[model samples]
Target: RLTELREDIDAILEDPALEGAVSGVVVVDTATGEELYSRDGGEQLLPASNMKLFTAAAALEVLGADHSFGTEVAAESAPGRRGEVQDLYLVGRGDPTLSAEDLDAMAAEVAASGVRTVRGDLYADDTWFDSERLVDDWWPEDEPYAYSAQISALTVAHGERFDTGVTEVSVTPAAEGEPADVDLGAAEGYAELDNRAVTGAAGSANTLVIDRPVGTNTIAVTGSLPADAAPVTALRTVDEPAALAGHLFEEALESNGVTVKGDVGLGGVPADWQDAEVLADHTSAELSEILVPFMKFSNNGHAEMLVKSIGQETAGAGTWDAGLVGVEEALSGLGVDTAGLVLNDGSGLSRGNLVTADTVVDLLGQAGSAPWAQTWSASLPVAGESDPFVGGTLANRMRGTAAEGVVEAKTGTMSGVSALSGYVPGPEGELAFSIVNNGHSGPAPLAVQDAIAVRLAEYAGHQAPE
Candidate 1:
């Protein structure tokens, strides 16, 4: 069985898709920690989102599965005779799932607490994490996308998936040659808009494009949409997400009958203030529940937030340097070797991240024995599953095959880099594997990786290949 598996995996790696690429492949038996097959397993290559395996495991270990983040509304003093307060602070302690509706609920609480007016400024306090937004090596061109959203302690999340630091832009066509109407969802007044799009003739090709230019807070809309076409919507990152959260909170306050006389801006609560009191607060879902959307969708923002949260929990600092060190420490404590790991950012988005197949498998083997093992494993995307939340990134792959619903894995991909690492449960025994590929001149070698996983799913102990 070992010889046959090796030859099959070798043949799969031979696919032209992997030509000129470095493939780090390794398989281990979970029960015995035996290496069944290895090819460049110790070679360091970009693991892409596979980097999340370390981040997630370290987070669960360091932060604990039951841990939750908090956001609150505070004031220097309680409301006075006429229900007026001197200042109001919307404090965010890095709750990545915070939504505009959450802000509204918080505001409602403030209003119900006899907070009719805020005489002083309504500040957005994001001091829980440092002001550093994007990682050092992240591409400027990718800044406008949701995957590369700025990291902030205070931010608004959109949609059921709870994507942070971004807003949805919807463009609706008018009469032919007229400017299309643009609507910024959560960032209505927070982000600027440059709408240069015009409605084209009926049935015309839809050439509409939406983008947030680098170094600016403007959502630029260009090209043309057909007159009869449906509305086009896109999720684009916004600059200064903390300020955006403040803006949204102020609106929610006004709508809820609590008026703020001063402007909304970024500021932390004064340490010297003697009577600072929390007016309202929100608690995020437990880390275990949040892990589903985070790992399944490969949320880059959530990964970075978790890293910073880890730093804050362990050390008093929330910077990436501190968080990354904490991640390594936690992994080391979990019996996984951190010798070859180079973590630039928690979310594999940073091109500077490097890991070996052996390192990934090492994590898989040790994490399975941890107390949070069930939650950790359940977060991985299931192969061939139709439900998006269940199958996640793997939903569309390995369907109607031996690997379907049998293989669970995390997928990572970017130009020139791809990775799929997770578990394959079999009646004989469970197998752990890692496949990281880099330097592919063509497209990502997903098909090749899928072939290998399917082959492993069909694998049975000490049996000849049919």
Candidate 2:
């Protein structure tokens, strides 16, 4: 039965769609580390977002499950009886989950604290992390997308939808031969949207292009939208996170009935300040709770923040270089071969990241045996599940297949790379697997991966037959 299963699975590897592709796979018994199957598993390929697996594991292990991020609003001097603060400070501890709503909540607390007037400037403190914004070697062209948002300790998402460095911008046609409307939602001032898109007649080609030039805040929207077409949203990263956050904070203060006489600026918290009052100190949801979004949606901003947090906590530095060192060390402790693995960023957005399928499986196997394995595994996207908390990236994939809701895996995708690494339940208990494809031209590699996973799911059921 195992022979037939392997043969059946191997047959799909020869599909014409996979022609001229570099494919690799490794499946092993979770308990004994026995190889169930192997194909070019030793070859290192671009891991893409699969790099998050390593980052997540290291964070969970180093930071623990109960970890939480804290963002605080402090005043250099205690407010007077009339609720006047000379200077206000917003200090960030690298919480990527901080949203605009969260800031509003903090503002409400500030109002409750009797802070009706601020005589001084509204300062944003992001010194918890280093000055470096972009990860090393990240594609310069990807800077405008939300997935490539700038990294800062003090930042805000449009809302709680998904906490990242970017907000969602949408466009929809008004009528036939009319101009389309563009909406930036709550994050309007974060960037400038130049709408050049016009509405076309029904059944016409709906060609739309939305782009932001490198290092610029102006996004040019060019395209023709078909009449009555569905809204199209583009996720764009903020050019300056601290400035954007300052804008959000300023708005929140005014909405809460506080008056600000000075302008807003970004800087480190005062070091020699003797007395500071806490108007509102916000604590984020625990790391266990955050892992759902971080792992499921493959949030690049969240991933990078985790790295920075790790660096800050472990090495007393909040830079990517320091944090990634800890990441490699933590993974090495899990028995992953560090000799060949190369990582350029916490998020696999960089094509420079390379790891072998064998290494991924090894990490998977060891993480399963660790103390935090349950929390770590639960963070992965469950195939075919509908709930956003469960399915995430795999919500619409492999539905009605044997792998539905049974396979928990991490997915990676780029122009020429695709990767999946995680665990599958089988009669023996559970199996760990990793599959990577490099240099593929089409979606064939993704299809091939899903097919291979389904076979494992079938094999798992076959061994436990009644």
Candidate 3:
């Protein structure tokens, strides 16, 4: 039976889609620790977002499934008889899901705390993590996109998906030949705008382009928009997210009847102010709940934050260097070998990351027996699942096939890299597998990967008479 399965996978690998590619494939039966198949499984290759698998597991191990982050509004001392405070502080303790509404609510709490007059400056304290933003090897051209958003301990997340460090830019066409109106949602006051886009004649091609030029906080709009076309919106990254969060919090304070007599800027809570009163606080959802949207959407910011959080929890410092060390330690403690792993950033956005197929399967096999195993496995995308939250990246693939709803896995894709690693439960037993492909000349060989997954699903379902 195993021989037939090996032959089937060998045939699938012969697809033209992998003509010049290097594939690292491995499969092992989880029940009996049996190797079902192997093809260059020990070779190292880019794992792309598949790196999140290790990040999520390490976070669960180090931070615990019930861990939650907190944001607080504090002052050196309570308001005096004259309703005056020396300085006010908005302290963010690495909560990536902090929304504008959350800040507003915190501000309201400040106002309701009685005396609310800040005589000094309003500070945005993001010292929970280091000031480093992007990784060393990330591309400069990709800086403006949400996927490459800057990492910060103090940042606002937009929308239900909780995209951090970005603001929505909406462009609406005016009459023909006029400049299009541009709206920067949460970044209106924080980020600058340079609008040169014009509304074209009716039925004309809409070639409007929006971008944040490198090294600046300006959202520059150019080209033309058809007068008859609908409004278009895009999420663009900002320069300094901590400053932006402070700007929004200041506005919320003013609107809530709290008076600030000084400027808003970045600063940390003074060590001398040990008795600083926490006026308002917001706690994020538990780590277990956060893993759903994080892994499902492949959120880069959340992964990095988790890494930094791990570093802070284990080493008292929130930095990629410190956090990555914690990640390897946690994985090692879980009994997975890290001999073939090279982690750059938790998101895998950096090209420097590498992993072997055998290593991925080893982690999978070990993670299955963990205390938080159920929550971790439930976060992967289910094959052929229609609902976005349930199917995630796999919602559109493997539908109406044997793999549908039988394969639960994580998907990774970049320029020349693609990976899928997860579990398949069969009548005989559950199986753990990993597939990593590199050096493909054309697009990713997703169809070829799907074919193999479907075949494995069939093999798992095969049963014999008792």
Candidate 4:
């Protein structure tokens, strides 16, 4: 018998049941700072998205959780028009959560301001940062999907236009001559609108897994979104995040009686411009809430945006390069081993990015004393339940079922690599661990990886297993 913790882990590691596998396990007691079982815990390995933890913690430290973004809507109010400006402008200050509903509300506010009809343009001010489209030079065109798009002041739906100002489309035979009665302002598509429809045959793939080939823009919506089921005219392109933001500003400004007749265009942000919208400031949810989406959904775009936000805070630039600098600084401060660290994007969508389990273990250990540790931990996915995007992490005999709400962690996976790291409530106390697998030759997913964690957590004492 080996030590209670080591015994179970060693048995599984040596068990013939698992063939050709590389793994690591490290645990720390929440109550008593004790190192339980550590196997190659210091070895560097590809850590995938788990790296977000370090980035987020660092960002929170630099940019307070209560920090808010800003978007300025400016335009020529008419030369000497006094109180009647000719046009309204939408300027962005890097607020990522600017949504369609938000625009509607803003529009209402603008209308309430007693303005009607503008004879000018609706320009978008995105000159808060440089105009680099991608985050870095190391990012690949065919990578899993890097969300390193431009960081406009008010980015909508991951910077895609169709994702904002959305409304469902339904076709009801036009009632012989009713003009289809489409919803006001809803974009129509080529699909034959069918107001009346029924669910397709069971298992006929009612859901569509949009896997637009890597590096391609046109997304191929497959898996039967239904050919004739009230074909909803949903979002397709953000066109440009800056434009959508301007529209949102128009919506808000119009609500306040401001008229924006000119088309929304982009240009350098003037050092001095009158503003009419604050769509830039976010809620408490935007801060800690954003991390959950990043961790649970493994969202590359959201991750990159946060990275840019960090860059904005650290180097005064939220670009991919500056963000990486902030990330490295954060990791180094955590005392994490950086010899194996090479990041291209903060989201890790770039295959060029490489991190080891040892580094994560060390980083998480250091996060214990950080002010943003709790918020960072809140972003981790609890391994269990049916949250769709948040489900996979919680499945497979995880503490999620037994402990229900006690486990919090981050998970990462690529073509052949899988990794998990974060905090767990052990019998002794709160412990942190990272188990990563770099070589998988078949369909046998890294089940053994999770198995290692389970067996270890079930440890009874210091007895070794045969």
> Clash number for every model?
0, 0, 0, 54
Q: Cα deviation of 179 in candidate 3 (Å)?
A: 1.1
Ranking by lDDT: 3, 1, 2, 4
TM-score for all models, in order of appearance: 0.98, 0.94, 0.97, 0.75
Q: What is the lDDT of residue 443 in candidate 2?
A: 68
RMSD list, candidates in order: 2.0, 2.3, 2.4, 6.4
Candidate 4's C-alpha runs over 4 A off are 1-4, 14-24, 28-35, 76-83, 135-151, 158-239, 247-259, 271-286, 385-403, 443-446, 460-466
Off by over 4 Å in 1: 461-466
Poorest lDDT segment (10 consecutive residues) of candidate 2:
457-466
CA lDDT for candidate 3: 0.92
TM-score of predicted structure 4: 0.75
Model 1 residue 261 CA deviation (Å) reads: 1.5
What is the C-alpha lDDT profile of model 2 across 301-410, one tens digit per residue? Answer: 89999999989778999999899998988887777778879978898998778899888887887788888888898999998889987898889988888889799999
Q: Please, what is the whole-model Cα lDDT of each candidate in the order they appear?
A: 0.91, 0.84, 0.92, 0.56
Instruction: Report the C-alpha lDDT of model 1 over 183-231, residue by residue, as the tens digit.
Output: 9998887888898999999999998888888899899999999999989
lDDT of 1: 0.91
Q: Whole-model lDDT for model 2 versus the true structure?
A: 0.84
Best by lDDT: 3
